[PDB]
């Protein structure tokens, strides 16, 4: 009978283990996993108030995405008596001077922001690792390869070893991809990436206490008949799109930047044509997968997108390109609408006619989805339901959202219960079907879902991770599940009691998906039993394996001032510098990466680069670099590209273009280097 | 049917039977063949083909009756949609309609 929440036994045990030895906490997603983070933060708050120059310390809450960082900053602010700052790229952190960072740490005891912001902050010596009491990494399973989590952890292998902070890793799932076999190797690799071993609850009392916020939803499968035959209007649309592609290859827009493949082996179309082709291919996919009506909504979405592109286009030829694309989209829309209308002889009642045409003009997947929706929420209270729909493609979200709007305003029983809404990842699609220049609706989809206005969420892998949403009664995985983490984490969205988890699977694919889900359950069991049975006294990986984990890549570069030039930040620093040299809108050109051929490589590097890749880089005409930096002979193209960028950045630093912190020199620094030579007489008058 | 709402049967037409011509606008169409062409893949077949049939009327979905439902209903058109149903094809509760 109290309001304030008390820490439980397992949370206190986790805090006691963490305060003595750093590690990773693996708990199911919920309020348990964040309360332990808050308690750990509170534990290491002894030196918060004392300033850094007086031996003080700070805390670091490093998040994966910006919105998760905002949520965690708000939670730490509203749950603790400290004051927290929010540091992400939207703030314009890039042009912050030394003083604006010094006073910034001086104000805030706890710093919350994305991993890249703190990586740049530390590598530029704005803080030292000795200045932080504790570092908290949430969703720590993302730290593999060259993810900024692992890059930040790499900074621990260079700095002073006796001044290292505590690293605490929060995660609800430990694996990222489908590498579910040999769980022990992956878990050991993750425990070596950080500097601790995994801890999780193992007492039956501890598990039962955990289950007061975590819930195991009941999971079911809804088989539907898959068919391959397709309509004739589909053939006409496909022929039109083929003809349009043939015409578009000769569109003759202005001269465009050269686009090549990921490893520079093969050429590619200009991105402006690639965008059109991508949209039309996506439309063909939606038409094949969900039916004629879904294509009818998709073509309106394409109309809107091409209209926005045409208005935003700057060249006349690009405007003509988008006009031709819009004309083709309009022809397709007219064809689909005619096909839909050539059925209405059945009856005059339009309200049931809409449902009839929707059910007749859709693949069995969509029909079964709509029927399961209808029987799930026949006559219920809109406040009593809160459900998510997970689909794969971005435009599938908008297509299904439009289809659901039309279907909801077609059925007497679902008209006043379901309120559909949708959201997608970065590069947001336009949420309108009318292409109006501006709309007065302002409230975001996720805010509407949180506030109870909407209860039907059509999302694409965006709400699987990070973003805080309330417990959901139903979670419909309309598209087939693909990855272990997606299965485990979307299964965690159905966090309410007796929640329903629904999978839609085709008849021909039932055995495959059943075996895949069985594999995921087995892998979860192996993770649990491996964590339970393993006993280790040292409970922290040693120095030799930690050094061996990071030693594969190119070694970093540090100067006398302490700044670190990470080889994986070399490309970013190079392009960021190249974005500052031009003094016009049309003067921006990126470095030209060229892969050397066999004869040229043999001519330059001799036989010492036989069987290895080398990359030559040509800087733009404005830059001081005009020497065609050559990369070291590397095994593969990606490493050679990194090496060439690293060498170019080192040469730039040697030439004084990087201001001893490995960021491009700004104008104020350039004139400050001259103030004492040309403006020396200013000092007698108290001005500089 | 996709209309899973419950409804009230008013009278049974003993003289009626499947294979009878639809009275209005579908004299060439019978109840049996129309049922097979509309949901025959869902029902398969109809048993007791010579037995009686039923005529049903729909119920309102509303629960608040304090305000007048003023509107242009076109009552003759509203009553125009008379529904004739095959008994074995519709689930029957034992609950009285009145």
């Amino acid at each position: 009978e109290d309001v304030e929440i008390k820490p439980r036994g397992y949370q206190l045990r986790l805090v006691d283990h963490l305060t003595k030895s750093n590690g990773i906490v693996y708990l199911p997603t919920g309020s348990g996993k964040t309360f332990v983070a808050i308690l750990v933060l509170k534990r290491f708050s002894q030196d918060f108030d004392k300033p850094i120059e007086s031996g003080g310390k700070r805390a670091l809450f490093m998040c994966n995405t910006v919105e998760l960082a905002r949520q965690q900053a708000m939670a730490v602010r509203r749950c603790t008596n400290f004051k927290v700052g929010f540091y992400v790229g939207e703030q314009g952190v890039d042009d912050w001077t030394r003083g604006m960072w010094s006073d910034e740490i001086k104000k805030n005891q706890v710093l919350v922001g994305t991993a890249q912001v703190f990586l740049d902050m530390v590598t530029q010596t704005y803080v030292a690792l000795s200045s932080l009491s504790v570092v908290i990494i949430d969703e720590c399973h993302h730290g593999t390869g060259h993810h900024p989590f692992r890059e930040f952890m790499r900074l621990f292998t260079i700095a002073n070893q006796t001044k290292l902070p505590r690293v605490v890793g929060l995660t609800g799932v430990l694996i990222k991809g489908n590498e579910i076999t040999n769980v022990a190797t992956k878990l050991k690799e993750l425990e070596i990436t950080y500097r601790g071993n995994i801890i999780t609850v193992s007492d039956t009392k501890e598990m039962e206490n955990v289950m007061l916020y975590a819930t195991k939803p009941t999971e079911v499968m809804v088989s539907f008949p898959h068919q391959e035959q397709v309509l004739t209007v589909t053939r006409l649309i496909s022929a039109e799109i083929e003809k349009f592609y043939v015409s578009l290859d000769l569109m003759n827009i202005g001269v465009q930047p050269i686009r090549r493949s990921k490893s520079l082996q093969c050429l590619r179309d200009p991105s402006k044509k690639s965008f059109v082709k991508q949209l039309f291919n996506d439309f063909l996919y939606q038409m094949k997968e969900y039916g004629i009506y879904a294509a009818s909504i998709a073509i309106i979405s394409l109309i809107v997108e091409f209209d926005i592109k045409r208005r935003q286009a700057e060249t006349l030829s690009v405007k003509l390109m988008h006009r031709t694309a819009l004309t083709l989209c309009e022809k397709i829309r007219h064809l689909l609408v005619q096909k839909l209308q050539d059925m209405t002889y059945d009856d005059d009642d339009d309200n049931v006619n809409t449902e009839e045409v929707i059910m007749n003009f859709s693949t069995p997947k969509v029909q079964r989805f709509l029927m399961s929706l209808k029987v799930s929420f026949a006559d219920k209270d809109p406040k009593d339901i809160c459900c998510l729909v997970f689909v794969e493609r971005r435009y599938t979200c908008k297509c299904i959202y439009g289809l659901l709007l039309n279907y909801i305003q077609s059925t007497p029983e679902l008209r006043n219960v379901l309120t559909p809404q949708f959201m997608v990842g970065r590069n947001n699609i336009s949420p309108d079907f009318e292409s109006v220049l501006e709309r007065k609706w302002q409230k975001s989809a996720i805010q509407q879902f949180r506030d109870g206005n909407a209860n039907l969420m059509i999302c694409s892998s965006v709400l699987e991770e990070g973003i805080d949403v309330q417990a959901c009664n139903h979670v419909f995985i309309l598209d087939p599940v693909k990855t272990f983490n997606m299965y485990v984490q979307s299964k965690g969205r159905a966090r309410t009691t007796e929640a329903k988890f629904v999978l839609f699977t085709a008849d021909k694919e039932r055995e495959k998906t059943i075996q895949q889900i069985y594999q995921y359950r087995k892998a979860h069991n192996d993770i649990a039993e491996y964590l339970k049975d393993r006993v280790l006294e040292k409970t922290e990986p040693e120095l030799y394996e930690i050094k061996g984990h990071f030693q594969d890549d190119i070694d970093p570069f540090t100067n006398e001032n302490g700044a670190v030039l990470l080889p994986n930040n070399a490309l970013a620093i190079l392009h960021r510098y190249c974005q500052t040299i031009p003094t016009d809108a049309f003067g921006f050109v990126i470095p030209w990466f060229h892969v050397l051929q066999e004869d040229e490589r043999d001519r330059i590097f001799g036989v010492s680069a036989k069987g290895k890749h080398v990359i030559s880089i040509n800087m733009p005409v404005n830059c001081m670099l005009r020497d065609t930096i050559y990369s070291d002979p590397m095994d593969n193209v990606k490493t050679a590209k990194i090496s060439a960028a690293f060498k170019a950045c080192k040469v730039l630093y040697s030439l004084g273009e990087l201001n001893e912190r490995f960021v491009p020199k700004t104008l104020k620094e350039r004139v400050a280097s001259i103030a004492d030579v040309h403006f020396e007489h200013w000092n007698k008058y108290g001005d500089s | 049917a996709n209309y899973d709402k419950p409804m009230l049967v008013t009278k049974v037409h003993r003289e009626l039977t499947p294979l009878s011509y639809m009275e209005k606008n579908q004299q060439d169409k019978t109840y049996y063949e129309f049922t097979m062409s509309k949901y025959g893949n869902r029902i398969g077949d109809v048993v007791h083909k010579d037995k009686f049939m039923i005529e049903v009327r729909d119920l309102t979905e509303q629960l608040t009756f304090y305000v007048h439902n003023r509107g242009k209903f076109n009552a003759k058109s509203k009553a125009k949609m008379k529904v004739i149903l095959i008994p074995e094809l519709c689930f029957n509760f034992n609950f009285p309609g009145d």
């Binding site: 068919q227 309509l231 007749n360 029927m371 329903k500 059943i514 | 893949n41």
Partner: peptide, 16 residues
């Protein structure tokens, strides 16, 4: 073909 084949209404949630 001209029509997507209709599905029955007797589907159920098979446990996985």
């Amino acid at each position: 073909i001209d029509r997507y084949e209709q599905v029955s209404k007797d589907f159920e949630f098979i446990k996985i």
